[model samples]
Target chain A: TQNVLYENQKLIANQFNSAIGKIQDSLSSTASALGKLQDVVNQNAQALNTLVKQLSSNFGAISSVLNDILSRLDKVDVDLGDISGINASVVNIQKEIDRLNEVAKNLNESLIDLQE
Target chain B: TQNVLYENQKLIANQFNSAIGKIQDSLSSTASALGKLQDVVNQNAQALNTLVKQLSSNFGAISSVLNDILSRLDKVDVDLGDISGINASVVNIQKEIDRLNEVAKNLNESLIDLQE
Candidate 1:
């Protein structure tokens, strides 16, 4: 009985180690992909902002693009509504991923602690 | 040896099952959190789409207005014509957002499939 539990313990730990490695990989790859998405999101925000500025300016660099944007913004009843939140929301998701990664890390440690 | 290999099997099975359940919980938590992030990204995308639609319409209207105002022929000559490519650029960015968000959803799917 003792040896059975012992072997099972080893069995489960090995299997779990594999699982953790895989879980971590998925999380890592996801995080990497998210970083790229974040870059796109940030750049687009700047581009949109550039468009916004052109419509609202007096010197008329980006300002030329403003009046129509503002007019449409008013007509549509939306302002792109200050989307700094998108980046922050993205950071929050990344934080959750780090938290998930930590879970695997700690679980791995727990498995390591199970040594005979 | 028989008891060690067999009699103790049930004990380990139950305990390992419990561990798997907890591991699944951590994974589920992470996946669920990521979904929240996905929701936000999609919401922002929709908002951008809304703005782009209105912007296109507003620019058309502005073109008409510019035409009417041109007959006055004042000393100030501001042409909204400089921004022709912006609409296409915006749609390109929009598509990028959509594509990246799809990547996100798939990543979440990968994470979800790891529960066993």
Candidate 2:
């Protein structure tokens, strides 16, 4: 009986050592893989951020175009109650301008204009 | 010789069992930790999805508002032109009213002379 428990104990000891070895091995591999993955994600995040910045820069230039057009039109005088036909045409142009501005602003914001 | 063999077996068995016990413990802990981590990731994904959807909805609403405002402004521009047309009508009516007033004044003066 003493010998049997002893033998069982021996068996248990062998299994225990084997498990410890495996744990160490697995931990090492897991840690290595995780480290590699983390590096990849961080690298990708940086690259994505850069791309986004570039896109924003391009959009920034577009805003300048709108600003330039607005400036050019600045000297134009606006009159109210001019010839009925002319006033009607001018009102139509104003509406078109407002619509265009709204669309442009939407495009800028959707593309994360502020992020630029 | 027999005692030597017995001792070695005992020691080796002891070591093996000890190692196995430790490995089992680690395995259990690792599995549990993995389970808990899985739950955490799932919950986080759900929450993140909700937040993303909410943000997207808000952006969509803002886009709709811009559209509505632009459309309304277009209508306003058209209406304003209509108002200009009304202004011309008003001017013509004012001129006719002025002429009538002068004619009435002339008639009143003639009545006064007759009374005299």
Candidate 3:
């Protein structure tokens, strides 16, 4: 009976250790995979941070460029207004030239009549 | 001697079961936490995918707006080279977003299998 009980104890211990070993093995793989996943997650998080920062700064840059373009357009608008004024002046000068031509024509007709 | 061996076997079995029971309890808790973690990962992945898709589509809309802006700017000789480069690279970023989405899906599935 003593020998039998001792044999049973040894068999139980062996089975228990085998079971624990398998569990441990499975757990090891799980832990390892989890660790790798964590690394990938960290890498992605860093990349996302960088992307957010870069994109935000790029927007700022775009805003500056837009402001510059807006100001340039505003200046061009002012210039267009000045150009319209210049066109009015040219029209006035043309009118004056037409008036001078009429006077010259009348003066020539008067001088021709005096000669007759 | 028989009695002693029997007593010893009982004690060993009790200790073994106690230890295994504790381990099983810890594993149960781990499994629950893992499930929650998986849920979080799933939610995060979905959110990220949506964000990426939104941004991807936004890029198209943004590109159209920028192109319109560029056309107006071109009339005034504003340089759009830099912005154009960024716009072109959005397609590349979209690809990366897709890859990250795929990785997230793979990780979630892998985690599920590990828990099982």
Candidate 4:
């Protein structure tokens, strides 16, 4: 009976260490995947910000140009037929701006997600 | 007494085994959380790729539309005088297109980051 208890103790010890080892392996894998994900998200945020700035600048430029065209269109006696298309194009550009804003909003959400 | 010593030994063993069991349970909980996080990241990477693809296609569409507008402007029989505003609008839109191209490139780089 003493021998049996000793044998059982040894078996339990082995099982304990084995479980610990598995836990360590899992922790290592999780850390690796998490670290990679963090890096990608950080890069994405930086790139996205840069893109947003450039997009904002273009939006301003486009707006100014449209305003200038509208101001000059009547004076130049140009047929207004083409003006409608320009207006539509301006609307399209605004939609693009709104789309970019959504991307930026999503990026903000990702940042929060990572933080949590 | 010999029996009393055996009882004490059994009590110690039981306590030790209980501690080990608790640790195993905690490690299991931790492993479960880590596995879930890893899965979330993998899914995020997939969604990121889809967003990039859609954005790339949208950028192409935007560029094509701008090019069509330019073509139409060129074909118009209006006096080319006082057309500087339209020209400026074209340049601004082109800048937007270029900005979008850069964004697409950065998104591709992000894909590479995720793979690594």
- Of the true interface contacts, the fraction found in model 4 is 0.00
**Of the pair 1 and 4, which is ahead by lDDT?**
1
**CAPRI-style docking class of model 2 based on DockQ:** incorrect
Report residue B3 deviation for candidate 4 (angstroms). Answer: 4.8
Q: Interface RMSD (C-alpha) of each candidate?
A: 6.8, 27.0, 11.3, 17.9
Name the runs in model 2 displaced over 4 angstroms: A1-23, A31-116, B77-116
In model 4, where do residues sit more than 4 Å from their true spots?
A1-20, A77-116, B1-5, B70-116
Per-model TM values vs. the true structure: 0.51, 0.39, 0.57, 0.46
Query: By DockQ, who's the top model here?
Result: 1
- What DockQ does each prediction reach against the true complex? 0.15, 0.02, 0.05, 0.04
lDDT of 3 by residue, B6-95 (tens): 776677666665665555555545545544554564555455556655664565566567668868777862222222221111111222
Candidate with the larger TM-score of 2 and 3: 3
Query: B109, model 1: CA deviation in Å?
Result: 20
Pairs of residues at least 3 apart in sequence or in different chains that clash in candidate 4:
none
Q: Clashing residue pairs, candidate 1? A: A1-B3, A1-B4, A4-B4, A54-A62, A54-A63, A54-A66, A55-A65, A55-A66
lDDT (tens digit, per residue) of candidate 3 on A8-114 = 65556454644444344335433433443354345445445544554455455456656666786778711211111111011123344445345534433322111
Among residues 3 or more apart in sequence or in different chains, the pairs in candidate 3 whose N, CA or C atoms overlap within 3 Å are none
Q: Write the per-residue lDDT of candidate 2 for residues A10-70, one digit (tens) a residue.
A: 5654564555445556644543443444344345434434544554455355445544544
TM-score of chain B of 2: 0.59
Across B9-100, the per-residue lDDT of candidate 1 in tens digits comes to: 44444434544544555555555554654555565565555555555555655565555445533423344544333332212234444554
Query: Candidate 1 lDDT, tens digit per residue, A1-116?
Result: 66666877677657765765686666566656655665666566566556655543422422345455546444632222222222212324556556555665554443333434
